[PDB]
Write a protein that binds this ligand. Structure first.
Ligand SMILES: [Mg+2]
Ligand SMILES: [Zn+2]
Ligand SMILES: [Zn+2]
Ligand SMILES: [Zn+2]
Lengths: 141, 263, 65, 196, 84, 43, 559, 49, 102, 133, 114, 159
RNA sequence: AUGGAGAGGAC
């Protein structure tokens, strides 16, 4: 029905993309001091609009909560490390016979999530638990 | 009576909420750890499996059985296996319970600590009955079995101490709090603009007088008066937690007194 | 992979509260926070024990053998 | 590891008693060091922990989606309605002692993952074992029960210290010491030592 | 040749590598119950002995220092100053 | 598994660098460290 | 290279490593399982025979024990099997291969092994659990931490080889290293944080806790020092008790910025004999630094007593801290109301200034800085306007964090963090850059396809106007991701080039030693230096001192 | 939850890994060195697939 | 004997300036018995500070330049590791050749 | 055992220089024109207003480890409001006719300046400064 | 795998005695009692108590490494009062407060509802 | 550039000067220019310094540049080490780099050079030139499994 | 056993 289009890097070169459906194009207008600073519309000669900025990340990074408040290299380090996090790898582990299978006893859908986790089935097949954790100098161990 | 003082503000089957006047901070705390970790209890500490054609793995189930709160009231007349002169276990030092469940129904069949069955000889003691606080009278969900599945095992519950495994804690959480408006400056509060408006007042601020800007700091003050609340998990009724708590602390303070004499 | 027989951190029995928590959610419509409260799951550590829980065993039973 | 590149391994385990405790009886499953926070600017961690706490109390599901109008201030108001101090902190008590902690501690649920890389799969030790045939040196690998390389770089270290008998011993009585017979004329190992 | 006892050029002091090696060497002799030359005062450790034997100048070994060219001077452990 | 099924490899002037045109096709964060950094990419 | 210059070897072990506030400096915690495998031959001798026959009775798998007794013939009685593990008379002269034990010297190592300090002799302490354990202060020469690093351990097999270790290689005798003529180990993290905490002029300790701390230092003479305060209630001062850890005749004096023998800011440092007179104790003193405590104590009282010093300073500080506590939260990334509005209006006056230049440069009234493009001048001016923006906005946020601010308390102690860490967490993260320039046009004339062509303005080109606290936007995210990948690459690439530089330097200097004539030579007896280092000295025994014949008026010199 | 996309070869599950190359049949110009004679080059990889 | 007087110059320069008469008596009023110690020390402490023949002083230099080269990572000149790759390579065409004129 | 200096002072400056327990205090003797004092007081134990007027003394007296006290049962040598135990670390001629001594009471510092003073303050291990009222 | 059994926290080993009493060499009339199989639960409670006894010049305890359930009490007393008595008394005192704390709690409890 | 220099009265004072900085190097000819101080001129190219003002000033400037790398980076390595390297490059007579080109040329025993870079070609014409080997090289004794003449091994022990 | 590949740990 021509509401969505597929664009490769070469055609991406010829179009102007809005980043957020609403915000980025109703007409023309106070604020919240907590909210990160944005820019605007400017240039209003769009051809296309982002489906959703959080879609620029792939699978492993899609797990990181608030990645947009982390120094990049960390988001990378957690990407290497999310892949080596025990939990249920498939529901049928009892009937497989793999060399090496690690299954976490009591998996737990994380308390802070990501809209993208939805499509990654992270909440159904989690790998990690929710430890009540404390930042403190204690015994020094 | 004479020394250290108790006032109970609230009391249930599961929670005693008290105030403890006229005591050292050392005693008030030491009592709290004893309650957490040194009052003896009964828990499954050995499971012999005979079938488990269940979705869950043998030692995983064994593990859950350990955590299941078993009646430990008359516990002081059960012995420690390690002490008792039998080989392995006996009726003097262990309660044995049995489990069988087979899924018969199309609908998923459950297995509850209700379904556990004392089989050794209790001989009068009030011990080993799995605790059930559940509304429909089936406490804890050991596991589920589908139509064909079967689980057939045998537990030996033994006398144990939270120090050795947290399964033996009569425990649950123990709230603890003194000097509710820092009249002792035992903390120093973190603030952005206002200590007082940003930290919230504890419930126990109805029980003490506020300090008045118009005053200078009381440097003689010591911590008295400690607002506790002990929650029991059931293997012992709350009153007994705090009493066996005090009983044990005294017991192992005693052995020190005794040991001076021996040596 | 079945309700924890016991909240980790603190020790409260939360094993018997699963069944019932499902009923508060679905059968009389309540919302998770409310449903948790009625179970006496008051301090937030035993309060995550249940809300974060995932019952994989309901998937595990699906396999025949 | 939390979910923000804060790896770290265990150093000790303390029981509930010895652990520091919230006034309501709560005790942590886990203590990380505040020194892991400032150099690594890993603020998501700090937010997920605070977000995570309201979710738990409120029974909702904290949304930490990337580009959203969810805000450390707005989480803090929510946490404040829940009766707790709006920035994470809670007064806590040392467990050895019952005495208040002077400082207040940032306390909260935070998703933590357990990684492969547990010690009893790394732990290895060898006091002589099996050798390769070609070099008559030790075999490689813990799975084969082998020795560890004394690398050129470690050889330099011993040279620098000036520990010569040790650099010798490491390269003879460990590893591949061997006795041969030389001709005092031509100088090769040509000799046919019909020893004995 | 050799190189004469008057006109030795090198430190009268004992280098740390000399020490280490003397103590090492005596501890190796002692460990094999070759005879012990001082008053072992409880001290049962072969190396901890050699240290006491050295602090008492009763170690009868001699140090042959090679100069780069092949010359060399002998000093006795008896005569070297042990500061350090 | 999910990650591994969606991987990229590049053999052998500035290839490891995250290039503007990666926007929205390749993940800006998920790549390995060392060795393979910027050459192994994830969709 | 891989078989002669470097062999795989016997008597070795590897595991995970973790830290231990209660090991001595020069100790190494060795798992009882590893302890049980690695061996040392001991000759049988009237001095050890009772301990040795006894270790054989234990046999090969009950800790202090042994496997293998070796005979006259030199045959191999194997104590795990062998019908006569139970018998066994021990003729003088048979070796017994006993387990490793407490105070055996072993050689400890973390790779890559970049300096002599990367392999050191520790004293074994056999302990439960499967990690090795070291003091935190032996952390840096190893360049270790406990996020999963692993370390090796090599056990010496002869009497002289353990001699060589405890006499040449021992951790104490490495504290002050020739590399930089300074200590290479100091007080770090918790201890360094809390020692500054302990010494504030506000930090007073009262009796109970004073006698506990006092008891914790084991060299303690059993003499309570007289409290600074007696008056209404005997208080002691943080400074006071910590001074129990510090030896006698240790003199040290400093002077920082304010400092004036009244140190109105508790600045600097004065330690008149083993007692600290004035000043907050932090990194400049107790860190691994040039003029500091650890330098002085080592030189002044001997490595032994200094090695022991680390121990004492931690046992006390670590204790005091366990009972003070300390922590960080998002609390300390929040700058003020008012401070936020300034940060925003600073940033904006930089945005509105880069505009003016871009306006002017386009209009053709910008002049070239001598010898460079018009366009080069523009970029240079813009990156300065935006770097100073980020600094001014940072420094503005640093001024508003209180003394009770945890991030700010770590900075002061010197335990972690720095201005830029504060800057980027609270104020503004700043300009993303790749290859020395701000973000390029990857597409024709734009940077992402959400911009129009030919747009050089802050945001378009990589300015992350936001803080980590407030959070990066989509564009900003990607950009900051670009800049980070550059750093990840040439961190992976740095270690490769350096790993080589090194190998060459070493292989090229390999055989240069100092011969018995103080001449510096090599395998050819070729002269490199006539007197080593020009002065004949060893770099460990050298300290910065001022030659004050050299400055000042001709008048004040004669005076 | 298994997603497919892989093969199974002698029991073992394999994933083919996407391989990156330059496009063929595309014309690119490249400035070249300065210790060089050939100063610009326009080049084309000619693919038929 | 000249190499010896050379080697020791810079240290004496210091010694002579610290142990000069006005100063000994005036700044830090030493007594005869204390002074004789202050000498006795200096000579011992000095002797202790001589480098020990045996010191593989080569390896020690490579590592001492090598190691901090490894803590190097990031407007004119080529600096850091790439500069150090050049210096040790006696690179014929360095990336930033430059004159400094006075 | 004995007194080593006495005088009455009038406070002229309180300073909570970013502390909440200590205060650098400035004062002048109400007798001697050639005389000032600066001192670190624990203002949370013995609170001090400006324009206060404190009696100040140095004893040396009424070392064996500090036995916990029983003082109106012992010899309190005080009946003063506020009493510290410090060390002397420098003796500085402001020249003339003008001598100042420096004291550290575990880091709470004090600098006193006068002239006849000297003839009584030895270079010593000493000094319990006492205050009252 | 290298973990020590948990019971070694509270059972005594091969001829471990419960207390060891040693003459402290540093100062006179002072003793260092080692308590095998205890921790803060006890060592803090005795320290705190020894400090109310006014013929006690010094009392402090310390758990030297936490892998191990063992602490040390160092005690010093006024000449004429042997250290052990100082502890002996200190223990009974504790027991009596606890004996009181017990009955005082009961009579309170026997008065409640729910 | 700022500059410290003795004052008319003794005290070192800040007395700043105008300095000139170049893209590119021609030392041979810029020093011969009128108007400047040919006594104090510098290039980072130490390879020209060596050509123009000879080997000793080359050494001095090769160090100046090595030092400047460590220092620019914040760090400080003691002078004796950087001197030793610099002196080792500098004693053959010209600049002798740290590669198979530089140091690994120099008639030091064959086994020693063979342990770096060009293993076999070194050992080949070591066979065809029929070389003798000292065996004083640390790394030859590594190979032979003997005690290196290295601290501890630098002398001998006797009776 | 040998020989090769790939993933991954620490800087
Ligand atoms: Mg690491
Ligand atoms: Zn029995
Ligand atoms: Zn809980
Ligand atoms: Zn022959």
């Amino acid at each position: 029905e021509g509401l969505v289009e597929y664009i490769d890097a070469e055609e991406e070169e010829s179009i102007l993309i809005a980043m957020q459906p609403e915000d980025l194009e109703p007409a023309e207008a106070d604020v919240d001091p907590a909210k990160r600073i944005r820019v605007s519309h400017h240039a209003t000669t769009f051809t296309h609009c982002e489906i959703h900025p959080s879609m620029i990340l792939g699978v492993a990074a899609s797990i990181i909560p608030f990645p947009d408040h982390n120094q990049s290299p960390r988001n990378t380090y957690q990407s290497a490390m999310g892949k080596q996090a025990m939990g249920v790898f498939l529901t049928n582990y009892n009937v497989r016979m793999d060399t090496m299978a690690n299954i976490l006893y009591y998996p737990q859908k994380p308390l802070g999530t990501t809209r993208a986790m939805e499509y990654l089935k992270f909440r159904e097949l989690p790998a990690g638990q929710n430890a009540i954790v404390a930042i403190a100098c204690y015994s020094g161990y | 009576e004479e020394g250290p003082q108790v006032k109970i503000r609230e009391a249930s089957k599961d929670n005693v909420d008290f105030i403890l006047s006229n005591v050292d901070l050392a005693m008030a705390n030491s009592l709290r750890r004893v309650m957490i970790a040194e009052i003896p209890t009964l828990a499954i500490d050995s499971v012999e499996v005979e079938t488990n054609t269940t979705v869950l793995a043998d030692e995983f189930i064994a593990h859950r059985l350990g955590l299941i709160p078993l009646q430990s009231m008359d516990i002081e007349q059960l012995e420690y296996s390690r002490d008792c002169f039998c080989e392995d276990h006996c009726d003097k030092c262990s309660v044995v319970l049995t489990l069988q469940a087979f899924g018969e129904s199309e609908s998923t069949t459950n297995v509850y600590s209700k379904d556990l069955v004392i089989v050794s000889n209790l001989m009068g003691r009030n011990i080993g009955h799995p605790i059930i606080q559940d509304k429909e009278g089936n406490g804890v969900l050991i596991c589920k079995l589908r139509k064909g599945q079967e689980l057939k095992l045998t537990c030996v519950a033994k006398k144990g101490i939270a120090k050795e495994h947290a399964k033996w804690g009569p425990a649950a959480a123990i709230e603890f709090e003194y000097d509710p408006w820092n009249k002792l400056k035992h903390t120093d509060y973190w603030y952005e603009q206002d200590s007082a408006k940003e930290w919230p007042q504890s419930k126990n601020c109805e029980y003490e007088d506020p300090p008045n800007e118009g005053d200078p700091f009381d440097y003689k003050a010591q911590a008295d008066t400690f607002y506790m609340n002990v929650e029991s998990v059931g293997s012992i009724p709350v009153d007994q937690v705090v009493v066996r708590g005090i009983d044990t602390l005294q017991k192992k303070v005693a052995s020190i007194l005794l040991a001076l004499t021996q040596m | 992979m079945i309700v924890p027989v016991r909240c980790f951190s603190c020790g409260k029995v939360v094993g018997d509260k699963w069944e019932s928590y499902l009923n508060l959610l679905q059968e009389d419509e309540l919302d998770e926070g409310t449903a948790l409260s009625r179970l006496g799951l008051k301090r937030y550590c035993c309060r995550r024990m249940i809300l974060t829980h995932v019952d994989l065993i309901e998937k595990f039973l699906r396999y025949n053998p | 590891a939390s979910r923000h590149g804060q790896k770290g391994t265990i150093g000790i385990t303390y029981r509930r008693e010895d652990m520091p405790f919230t006034a309501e009886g709560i005790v942590p499953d886990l203590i990380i060091n505040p020194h892991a926070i400032p150099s690594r600017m890993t603020v998501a961690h700090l937010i997920e922990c605070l977000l995570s706490k309201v979710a738990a109390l409120s029974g909702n599901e904290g949304d930490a989606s990337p580009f959203t109008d969810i805000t450390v201030e707005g989480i803090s108001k929510l946490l404040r309605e829940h009766g707790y101090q709006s920035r994470g902190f809670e007064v806590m008590y040392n467990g050895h002692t019952g005495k208040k902690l002077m400082a207040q501690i940032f306390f909260g649920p935070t998703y933590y993952q357990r990684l492969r890389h547990m010690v009893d799969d790394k732990i290895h030790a060898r006091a002589r074992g099996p050798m390769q045939v070609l070099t008559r040196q030790p075999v490689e690998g813990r799975s084969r029960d082998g020795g560890l390389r004394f690398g050129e770089m470690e050889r330099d270290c011993m040279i620098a210290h000036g520990a010569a008998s040790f650099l010798k011993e490491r390269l003879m009585e460990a590893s591949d010491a061997f006795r041969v017979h030389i001709c005092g004329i031509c100088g090769l190992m040509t000799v046919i030592a019909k020893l004995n | 040749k050799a190189i004469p006892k008057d006109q030795r050029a090198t430190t009268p002091y004992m280098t740390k590598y000399e020490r280490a090696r003397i103590l090492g060497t005596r501890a190796l002799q002692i460990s094999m119950n070759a005879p012990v030359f001082v008053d072992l005062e409880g001290e049962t450790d072969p190396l901890r002995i050699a240290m006491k034997e050295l602090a008492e100048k009763k170690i009868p070994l001699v140090i042959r220092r090679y100069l780069p060219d092949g010359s060399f001077e002998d000093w006795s452990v008896e005569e070297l100053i042990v500061d350090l | 598994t999910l990650s591994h099924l969606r991987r990229t490899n590049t053999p052998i002037a500035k290839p490891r660098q995250l290039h503007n045109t990666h926007w929205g096709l390749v993940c800006p964060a998920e790549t390995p460290e060392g060795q393979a950094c910027g050459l192994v990419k994830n969709l | 290279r891989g078989n002669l210059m470097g062999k795989r070897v016997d008597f070795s072990a590897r595991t995970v490593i973790s830290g231990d506030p209660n090991l001595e400096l020069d100790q190494v915690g060795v798992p009882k399982s590893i302890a049980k495998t690695l061996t040392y031959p001991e000759v049988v001798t009237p001095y050890n025979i009772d301990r040795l026959t006894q270790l054989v009775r234990n046999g090969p798998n009950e800790h202090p024990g042994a496997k293998y007794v070796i005979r006259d013939s030199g045959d191999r009685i194997d104590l795990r099997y062998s019908k006569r593990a139970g018998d066994i008379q021990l003729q003088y002269g048979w070796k017994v291969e006993r387990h490793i034990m407490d105070n055996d010297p072993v050689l400890f190592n973390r790779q890559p092994s970049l300096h002599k300090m990367s392999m050191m002799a520790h004293r074994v302490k056999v302990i439960p659990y499967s990690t090795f354990r070291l003091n935190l202060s032996v952390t840096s020469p190893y360049n270790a931490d406990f996020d999963g690093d692993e370390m090796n351990l090599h056990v010496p097999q002869s009497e002289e080889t353990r001699a060589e270790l405890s006499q040449l290689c021992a951790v104490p005798l490495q504290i002050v290293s020739p590399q930089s003529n300074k200590p290479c180990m100091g007080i770090v993290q918790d201890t360094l944080c809390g020692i500054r905490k302990l010494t504030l002029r506000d930090t007073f300790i009262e009796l109970d806790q004073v006698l506990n701390m006092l008891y914790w230092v084991p060299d303690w003479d059993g003499v309570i020092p007289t409290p600074a305060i007696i008056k209404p209630k005997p208080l002691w001062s943080g400074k006071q008790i910590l001074s129990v850890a510090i030896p006698n005749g240790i003199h040290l004096q400093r002077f920082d910025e304010g400092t004036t023998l009244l140190s109105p800011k508790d600045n600097g440092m004065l330690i008149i004999d083993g007692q600290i007179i004035f000043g907050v104790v932090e990194k400049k003193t107790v860190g691994s630094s040039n003029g500091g405590l650890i330098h002085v104590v080592t030189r002044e009282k001997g490595p032994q007593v200094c090695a022991k010093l680390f121990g004492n300073i931690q046992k006390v500080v670590n204790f005091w801290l366990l009972h003070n506590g300390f922590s960080t939260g998002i609390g300390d990334t929040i700058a003020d109301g008012p401070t936020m509005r300034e940060i925003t209006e600073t940033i904006a006056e930089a945005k509105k200034k880069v505009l003016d230049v871009t306006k002017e440069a386009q209009a053709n009234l910008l002049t070239a800085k001598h010898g460079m493009t018009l366009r080069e001048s523009f970029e240079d001016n813009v990156v300065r306007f935006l770097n100073e923006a980020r600094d001014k906005a940072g420094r503005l946020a640093e001024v508003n964090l209180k003394d009770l601010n945890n991030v700010k308390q770590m900075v002061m102690a010197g335990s972690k963090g720095s201005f830029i860490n504060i800057a980027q967490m609270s104020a503004c993260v700043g300009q993303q850059s790749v290859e020395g320039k701000r973000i390029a046009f990857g597409f024709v004339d734009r940077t992402l396809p959400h911009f129009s062509k030919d747009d050089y303005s802050p945001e378009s080109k990589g300015f992350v106007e936001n803080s980590y606290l407030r959070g990066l936007t989509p564009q900003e995210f990607f950009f900051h991701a670009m800049g980070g990948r550059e750093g990840l690459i040439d961190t992976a690439v740095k270690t490769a080039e350096t790993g080589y530089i090194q190998r060459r330097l070493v292989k090229a200097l390999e055989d240069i030693m100092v011969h018995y004539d103080n001449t510096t030579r090599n395998s050819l007896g070729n002269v490199i230096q006539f007197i080593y280092g020009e002065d004949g000295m060893d770099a460990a025994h050298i300290e910065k001192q001022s030659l004050d014949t050299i400055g000042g008026s001709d008048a004040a010199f004669e005076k | 939850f298994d997603m497919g996309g892989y093969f199974i070869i002698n029991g073992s599950e394999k994933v083919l890994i996407a391989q990156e190359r330059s496009a063929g049949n595309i014309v690119q110009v490249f400035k070249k060195a300065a210790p060089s004679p050939i100063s610009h080059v326009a080049e084309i990889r000619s693919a038929l697939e | 004997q000249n190499a010896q007087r050379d080697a020791v110059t810079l240290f004496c320069c210091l010694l002579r300036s610290r142990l000069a008469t006005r100063r000994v008596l005036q700044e830090y009023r030493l007594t005869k018995q204390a002074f004789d110690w202050v000498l006795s020390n200096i000579e011992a402490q000095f002797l202790r500070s001589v480098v020990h023949p045996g010191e593989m002083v080569g390896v020690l230099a490579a590592q001492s330049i090598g190691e901090p080269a490894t803590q190097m990572t990031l407007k004119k000149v080529t600096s850091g590791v790439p500069r150090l790759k050049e210096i040790l390579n006696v690179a014929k065409n360095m990336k930033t050749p430059s004159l400094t004129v006075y | 055992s004995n007194t080593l200096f006495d005088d009455i002072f009038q406070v002229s400056e309180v300073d909570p220089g970013r502390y909440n327990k200590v205060c650098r205090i400035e004062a002048a003797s109400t007798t001697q024109d050639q005389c000032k004092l600066t001192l670190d007081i624990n203002v949370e134990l013995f609170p001090v207003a400006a324009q206060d007027s404190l009696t100040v003394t140095i004893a040396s007296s009424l070392t064996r480890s500090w036995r916990p006290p029983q003082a109106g049962d012992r010899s309190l040598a005080d009946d003063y409001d506020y009493v510290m135990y410090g060390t002397a670390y420098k003796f500085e001629e402001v020249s003339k006719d003008l001598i100042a001594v420096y004291y550290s009471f575990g880091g709470l510092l004090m600098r006193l300046e006068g002239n006849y003073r000297n003839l009584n303050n030895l270079k010593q291990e000493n000094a319990y400064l006492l205050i009252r009222r | 795998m290298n973990a020590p059994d948990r019971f070694e926290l509270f059972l005594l080993g091969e001829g471990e005695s419960k207390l060891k009493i040693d003459p402290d060499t540093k100062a006179p009339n002072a003793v260092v009692i080692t308590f095998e199989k205890e921790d803060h639960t006890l060592g803090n409670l005795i320290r705190a108590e020894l400090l109310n006894d006014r013929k006690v010049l010094f009392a402090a305890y310390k758990v030297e490494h936490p892998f191990f359930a063992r602490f040390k009490l160092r005690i010093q007393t006024t000449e004429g009062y042997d250290p052990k008595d100082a502890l002996k008394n200190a223990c009974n005192s504790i027991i009596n407060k606890l004996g009181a704390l017990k009955t005082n709690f009961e009579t309170e409890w026997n008065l409640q509802t729910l | 550039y700022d500059r410290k220099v003795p004052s008319p009265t003794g005290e070192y004072v800040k007395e700043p000067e105008w300095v000139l900085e170049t893209d590119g190097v021609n030392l041979s000819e810029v020093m011969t220019v009128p108007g400047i101080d040919p006594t104090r001129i510098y290039t980072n190219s130490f390879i020209d310094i060596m050509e123009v003002l000879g080997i000793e000033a080359g050494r001095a400037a090769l160090y100046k540049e090595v030092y400047n790398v460590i220092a620019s980076d914040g760090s400080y390595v003691n002078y004796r080490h950087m001197a030793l390297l610099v002196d080792v490059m500098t004693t053959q007579g010209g600049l002798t780099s740290v590669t198979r080109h530089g140091f690994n040329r120099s008639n030091t025993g064959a086994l020693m050079r063979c342990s770096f870079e060009e293993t076999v070609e070194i050992l080949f014409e070591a066979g065809a030139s029929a070389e003798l080997d000292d065996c004083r090289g640390v790394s030859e004794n590594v190979i032979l499994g003997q005690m290196a003449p290295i601290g501890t091994g630098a002398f001998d022990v006797m009776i």
